[PDB]
Amino acid sequence: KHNMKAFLDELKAENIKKFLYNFTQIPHLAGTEQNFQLAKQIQSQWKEFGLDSVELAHYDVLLSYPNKTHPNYISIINEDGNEIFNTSLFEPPPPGYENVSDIVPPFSAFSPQGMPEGDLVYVNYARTEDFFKLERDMKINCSGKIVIARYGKVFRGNKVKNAQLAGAKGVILYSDPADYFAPGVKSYPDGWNLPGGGVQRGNILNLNGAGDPLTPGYPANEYAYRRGIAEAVGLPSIPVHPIGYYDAQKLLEKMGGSAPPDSSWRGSLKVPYNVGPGFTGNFSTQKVKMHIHSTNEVTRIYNVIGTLRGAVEPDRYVILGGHRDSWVFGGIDPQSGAAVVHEIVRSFGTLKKEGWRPRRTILFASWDAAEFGLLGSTEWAEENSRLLQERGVAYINADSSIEGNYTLRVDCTPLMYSLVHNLTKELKSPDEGFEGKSLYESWTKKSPSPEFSGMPRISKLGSGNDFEVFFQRLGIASGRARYTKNWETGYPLYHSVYETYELVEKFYDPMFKYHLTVAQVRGGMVFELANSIVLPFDCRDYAVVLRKYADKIYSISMKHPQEMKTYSVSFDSLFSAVKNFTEIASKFSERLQDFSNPIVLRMMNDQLMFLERAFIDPLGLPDRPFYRHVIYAPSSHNKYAGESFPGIYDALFDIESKVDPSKAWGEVKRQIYVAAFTVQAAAETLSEVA
């Protein structure tokens, strides 16, 4: 038989290991020859594996690179203009790689050039709440200052956006051991902790889902008309550079001015964590100077797109995609994901060579330039948006398979909750102490649901990964799964040169059993979405969460009862809409269970497929035209986090500070109307069609 169990049994830990080794011997930075060579290799291998067609889809997009002959660095500058301390020009390379060529030194992609000279202010994580604390409580003025911020808690671009708007002329980002050095664990190469010379790379764009900064809305193809740099989307306006904690210590140790307001502002370094501005009396006349010479350059990128044509519904697409580009070796990010995708393609291909085809078409994607702002997946979706929104059933992402070895982590639409629960009950747990038990059992024990007994935690989707354009712009049901760490007690080497094959094989997953379990979850999801007669979506699960989200947004508003009285702010329409969605979903599920008629089936499969699509508003969210999903959007304060009813949430955020409360509460009421209307309209897609 060719059923799911046949597909799953063909997946092998040893193959995943072989592929991971093969993908991580040299750097694969977006836009470089080595990453084009890897694209060609994967294209060739996916053809060998048995896919019907495998093509490269290329685009010419804005990328950013350091200048090879004028390196980026930061200085402490004395009274005379002598540079008395300089940060590192590169991370000490890991053992055995000290002669590998073309390792990109640490930099912040898309930083402008500049050499700003100034006094530091230390801004904790540079979160919006951290800036509120500085300015409103401590009365510290960031205007004209260089801010030094520690990484962690939110996406780094959001930090830079916050720093900009606070008036800063530069940002130094660093990794504090409080956030990236786990107690009792050795630094790389003898454990998985971050050494003092390690540095986290990463882009600092604020694109809000636009993709290539020069071509928002349209693919960056050969005839594309590009915005000028001055009109580009999302580019930072102040120089930015990341450093390690050895170099950060040398910068923080002289900080004067105000004490930290409290212990949540102190990291683990042996420094005062003084907020500034400026250094203590002896060194009051020294300043910090940035030297940033990186250049933005339109560069060709390549996606690999593999097709396994459906036997019955070839015009319905289930997509498994993850990126291929890495900052350096990509040991975890993304090659632990890409190796899993490669073995999934191999397994589907094995079944295909034996005469099997899935019911629906499966598309497999190896995306380029994800590290520079999800550029490869976004340009491809812009090029193919008409096909995807009329044919796209689901998107399963496949970036890093592991970020820890403790338990499963799943983030997905409520439409896939039942599918995930059912699949994980049929898979074996890889965990110690759970041998012979299901993955559902181990996951639920380690990561319990906050609301329900005997259920696991599943998170929302925001951004930060290649599902973003599919889910937040186009409204295609999306999910992701990986193995993760224990939060109760990014990983330390994230985006550093130390993310290697050896890191994974020695410290994360020596037997590749966690990788195998992730391959079974992602591959299993794809198999069920592409083969189940009725799409494996349960609309009643959306109804349950919509009520939770409506309760939660109402509770936020109810912090301001006088204003709700004054401006007549009612959530009655939104609760009515959610109640109607609940009733209609219940009736639809009865019909689905109770309907030989392939027209009624496909009519009902179309109602299932277009249900996620119904939460899209074609006008987008306010000043964010490419975030269109009314229920979820990436948080306006943290791209990594999903926010529910984002339009209403943003209208309420810090509302007590708004200068015209009538207008502000009017906008809250407008967002309640948009949300209530969208929920009711989605509900009505599930009604009998005529």
Add this chain to the structure above:
Amino acid sequence: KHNMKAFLDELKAENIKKFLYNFTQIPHLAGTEQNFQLAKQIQSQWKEFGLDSVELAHYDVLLSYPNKTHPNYISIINEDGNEIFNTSLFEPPPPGYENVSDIVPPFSAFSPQGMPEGDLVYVNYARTEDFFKLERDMKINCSGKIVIARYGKVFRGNKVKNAQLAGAKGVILYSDPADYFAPGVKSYPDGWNLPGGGVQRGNILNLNGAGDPLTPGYPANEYAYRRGIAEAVGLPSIPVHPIGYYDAQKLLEKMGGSAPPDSSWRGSLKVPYNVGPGFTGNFSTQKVKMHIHSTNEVTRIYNVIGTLRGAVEPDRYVILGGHRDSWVFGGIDPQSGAAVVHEIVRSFGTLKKEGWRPRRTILFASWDAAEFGLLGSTEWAEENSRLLQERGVAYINADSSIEGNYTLRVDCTPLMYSLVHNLTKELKSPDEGFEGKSLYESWTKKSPSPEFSGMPRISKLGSGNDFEVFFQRLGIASGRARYTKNWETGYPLYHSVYETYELVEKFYDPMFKYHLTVAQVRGGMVFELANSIVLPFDCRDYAVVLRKYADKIYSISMKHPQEMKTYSVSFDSLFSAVKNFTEIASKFSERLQDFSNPIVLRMMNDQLMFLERAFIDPLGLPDRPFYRHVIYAPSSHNKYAGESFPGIYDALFDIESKVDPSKAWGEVKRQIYVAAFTVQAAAETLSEVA
């Protein structure tokens, strides 16, 4: 048998006549009790006729009405502030109706209040070219003036928009006998010409497809959050009032200043048609004073929505819709259309009572408030947009069935050209001298195609009618057909109190044979769209027109060869896209002809249905977010006319006057890229799906 011929044979001229009489005895102005009573009657009758369900869909939208106790009028005002002449307070009512209550006096809907006093400038038709001539050639300054313009040639709102931007403080609109009095024909009631006391009503909004000015994007339902009047969409900012030619003569006869530049500026009145500004020397000290007291008021409107559920594909909708609201009696506009819709519903119902159902669902609509800006159809489409864009096969409009008695007029998407040609070859011509000949033969003889021998003229769609939201915002294939006049040699009584049943029965269509022929065309189109196994769309016809439109836009650009050299403006991408569309459409048509498999059929019917949808750009046209179709949009100078490649056309329009030619030609290049990309993307929807 229940086939098309059975449907068509059941339609009767005598029933159309009976219904037209029934619909036109009292006024049915949007928002009034009489028009709600008619909605209830139609709902009841459509139920009786056999529809599965018939509901009222209501919305609360901005309407505009005169003040019953402070009437609108225009004055000539002397030096002392004595009003020496006043325009009429109402049109003399037609014979037998002089005691009918609730006739709305002539007014311009949505005019603001005001009493501006000034000197006139006569602006011909107030077209953009007329304003160019005044300002650039004659150096006449409209700032602070009351402009008097004649109706005709373009939609009246576009006139008011032009007048506003020229700085005017008021607009007087009038009907010149050159445009509304056919030579040798008697005035109403003794012929179909416009009498001197007749006045054309009509709204003067510039909504650009938004629908209700207070709720753009979302239905004006019970919980809607409304913009303030100051933020409303499309409202004119200067007072506007329409008058007849007896009253216009009294205003024009004193005009001084400059002579008309040429004979195309002179109408038929016995006046000089002097452009002004102001009156001749004897009366130089007199001014014109407007008195406008109309009020905008949120008012409930009602659409009737009838459903005939499909037997095989109930989730595919073919829509026949036209409006019900009229300015006064609606003898032609819209009741000549609504009477045809009523007989079509009756005929489909007859077949339904005998056990027949169409293959796909047919929706029938009686729209409200079309006269106030297509409000009823637009709010309904906003409410149901998710259902329509995933299920909508086609929209056939049904406003006035006649505007003349000479020949057929069809405006539609190229996807319906073959369907119309085939249907009209099977229908009998109603025309004198063509007895026993087909309607195709008579139409083609009277209205030949410009480009092809032995083919009829079919026009493009713009706006001005209720197909606008379906076609231009949502991308649902749309069409319209009516009987029209001979252009080689609006109709005179358009939007006047003289549009009565007697007008039609005595002067336009005494036997109701032209109405019957229109019922066969519209009803026949609906029958074929709702019943044909394969959708009756021919993608190759789109390929032919796209090449014509690309040739035409290139020719416009080629008026500026130096600039195209300087800024490297190439249309190569657009021609490549059109060539690819041609090739792919040809291959798709081969597969369609050559494919027992209902999945392949429906897959291919989905490719046909979503082909119009592929021409929608989710970002809309520049500053017009609700006009989304890249191939067609209503002209930016005349809402009634369709324009092809509107984005490029507007970027080229008057480009030689732009102050920064680099930026202007950059925008032309951007629009060429958007157009080329959209054509290629539409083409790719017709490729094999996997």
